[PDB]
């Protein structure tokens, strides 16, 4: 078996495997997320670009994990990838929840996974974690609290007036 | 008579020469809807400009299926061009559903002469339509629903407050 | 009624909306002129681009018209407007004919609004067409009167040879 | 046989080597009458610019169809390219009356291919024809009927003068 | 329902939504070809580059498509996604036929989905896929029967060399 | 007769005519080389693009004697235009081979036509040919007979990788 493979466990190996697979679920729930917000009866284009930019945010994940399997000598296998848990996501605040429920999701997956290396000694997994996901799901989760808490400011006030106005002044259009 | 005239029925010139009918009376409609959000006791000068760029379109629309028409060697016929339904236009609301039903009209009768073309086996028609009418129109009527949208979820919420933001944040001044 | 109105006659208010009627009727007629000569049996282009320039510049007439009616606080009222006087419009020479009466109509109807403004004590009203439309008028009629002298000079000779001479080397293709 | 064919009928394999044949054909055609008006007693410099230009346009549609019968999977096949109709070609209006004839069998050509795709339901190939050709040559036409009717005009009056009239001041040179 | 919905068929609907979950699935094919080609012991790099490229191509035929849907007023839903068909493809032979027996599947849902269009007299739809889908598949079949006839002849040759040679002087890199 | 002709043979017209004839059936003889190898089973780009750069020069020949059949007082002649030999070219060896005869079989028809100018004491045809054609037909035997070699040697070797690479390092792409 692998030339090049070293220090590398197959728990390890097996856990990327899965977390890629979380990663294009993330993903495949972003499209969603994105194009209900782009109907013509939601019609808030700020918030579906906000989404569909999170959608190549996680596929752009995925791919890392993938190149990182490769260079490590491990095997990518895939799998079935489950649709989104809802086919309509109510309004911007519902969906921000769910994002943030998601993105926690796989915070914790991350961290998981971390902990596993840890335990295995496998340095260059903790590093390649911490360097290139734990910082960003951190700010990312961030991001999501603070948009939480202006949509909620702002919805409580009134529902669509509040919508309306953080999609035009926040989101990016 | 016509030197050029090559599998152009006499059905679809006239209904060619209906449509431009239709267009120009458009553009006409679209006129009075823009000066009437110019009125000082409207003044929304984003919807005035919208449905001012609207009539541009259908005039060019027109000037497009006149060019055609004498491509194809048909003779254009001008017949009256009824005046707008109605002289005041209440809402922004009230405005975008009128030409939304306008559109929708439009595009039956892009549909329609369509299905003629189809039936006279004309496949320049078919493919005029397809390239320069009717994916235009479906962008239309699909920006429009956005618009709807939008204006409904501010003016449910505060009529005159939610007007004006559509005005300022989404129409173009 | 209006906040903004100030010596502004109801006369004068009406006269303003029929005058865009006429000006909207003037470009219409242009716009079958040009088609006309667009036409493959027809065929003279410079002819064609003179009229639908015209065309252009009768609707902008009707838009300032429209705005100052606006500025004044008055109300544009639209109303049918009537097909060309012809289906088909002869020679260049028919048509330049048929387009100086047309001119001649517009301007007395200027005119008659001048005439009414200065016996309703409107000052803005004589000023607005002075500066915008009489000059215009008189400049336009000017050079198809020059069009005219140099298409009879050039068809009193060869008809078909005056008439391809004068389209290639008067008018703008 | 081919590894990529697909909803490709036999029927339209050997139609489009037809309509090859013929635009190869259509070319040499315009080769023949662009070196007759560069004869030192014909000499009429743009008349030959003008139907050396028109076998450029042929020889690239040939390639068109061409390149799209081995897109499609099909097999080019060549025959034998039928010399022009006259040696000798008359003058500019016999000229281009017989360029006119030879568009619209062309243009003939093309709608009996489309009807042929249409039966077979060859949704490729319809698109290929109204993308890349039947626009074309409705353009073409109307061309070639405008100055048709600039030639008769000119000729009608005079008939040496109009023919060098036309080729100084409508075609290129 | 539907404000802006127009001579859409629940059909159509459907069958959009399917033929997404086909390009999405057909995405995360080329995503595991990409990655295979990138094992340390498979090591053909402008094969991975290839299928990745074309991982994206399929992404944005379906997001277009789901685009598309909106337009027209249809409710975009999305089912699970089914793994690719092998975790392991083989050669850069046995891996290109692969891809083009995807491609043919793809088109053959294109195709049904045209002709259920046209039974529907839905020319938006037919349009749309002849402008964007159908002339795409048609060019990317015939590279890939390109590539297939030269990875062929160059591995019947001599294996291992053949496929080096055409990885590296076909394929970007 | 004619006004400019002088020291013109009806010998040289007529050859010149069929050298013009053989110049255009070498052009399409080209033109059906090149798509042969365009073909999905075939598939040699630089092979399909050496090819078709010279059916262009080969028109481009025929173009050049037309141009000076003119110059000179002649009447240029066309006549049916042969087919290419075969409807299929087998391998770039076969391919190569065909079009060295060809090159051969106009060279000497140069040959010809240049001593029947020295018979008929034509040196303006003399130096036509020696400026435009003889030099030109060497240098491209020479480079015919090189790549013959290079292909030899190649294919001699591994018939489908010397192919492959000849197409790649040598011809254009
Ligand atoms: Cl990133
Ligand atoms: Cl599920
Ligand atoms: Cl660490
Ligand atoms: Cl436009
Ligand atoms: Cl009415
Ligand atoms: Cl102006
Ligand atoms: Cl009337
Ligand atoms: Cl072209
Ligand atoms: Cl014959
Ligand atoms: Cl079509
Ligand atoms: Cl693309
Ligand atoms: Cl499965
Ligand atoms: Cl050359
Ligand atoms: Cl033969
Ligand atoms: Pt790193
Ligand atoms: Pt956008
Ligand atoms: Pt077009
Ligand atoms: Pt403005
Ligand atoms: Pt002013
Ligand atoms: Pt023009
Ligand atoms: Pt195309
Ligand atoms: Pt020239
Ligand atoms: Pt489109
Ligand atoms: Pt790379
Ligand atoms: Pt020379
Ligand atoms: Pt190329």
């Known amino acids: 078996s692998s030339q090049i493979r070293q220090n590398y ?3 390890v ?3 990327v495997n ?12 972003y499209l969603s997320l994105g194009f209900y917000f ?6 808030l284009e700020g918030v579906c670009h906000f989404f569909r930019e999170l959608a190549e945010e996680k596929r752009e994940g995925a791919e890392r994990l993938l190149k990182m399997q490769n260079q490590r000598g491990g095997r990518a296998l895939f799998q079935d ?4 848990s809802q086919d ?15 993105e926690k999701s796989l915070n914790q997956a991350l961290l998981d996974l971390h902990a596993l290396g840890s335990a295995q000694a496998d340095p260059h997994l903790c590093d390649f974690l911490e360097s290139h996901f734990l910082d960003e ?9 603070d948009h939480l808490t ?3 400011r702002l919805v409580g006030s009134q529902a669509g007036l509040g919508e309306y106005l953080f999609e035009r002044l926040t989101l990016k259009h």
Do not use: F, H
């Not at 782009?38 to 019609?43: F, Q």
């Not at 990838?81 to 989104?84: D, I, T, V």
């Not at 309509?88 to 998601?102: H, N, P, R, S, Y």
């Open 88 to 102: 309509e996501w109510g309004t911007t605040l519902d969906a921000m929840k769910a994002a943030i429920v998601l």
């Open 150 to 152: 202006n949509i909620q």
């Open 13 to 15: 190996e097996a856990a």
């Open 18 to 29: 899965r977390l890629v697979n979380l990663y294009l679920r993330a993903s495949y729930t």
């Open 81 to 84: 990838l489950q649709k989104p």
């Open 9 to 11: 466990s197959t728990e």
């Open 137 to 145: 799901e951190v700010k990312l989760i961030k991001k999501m609290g």
């Open 38 to 43: 782009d109907r013509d009866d939601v019609a």
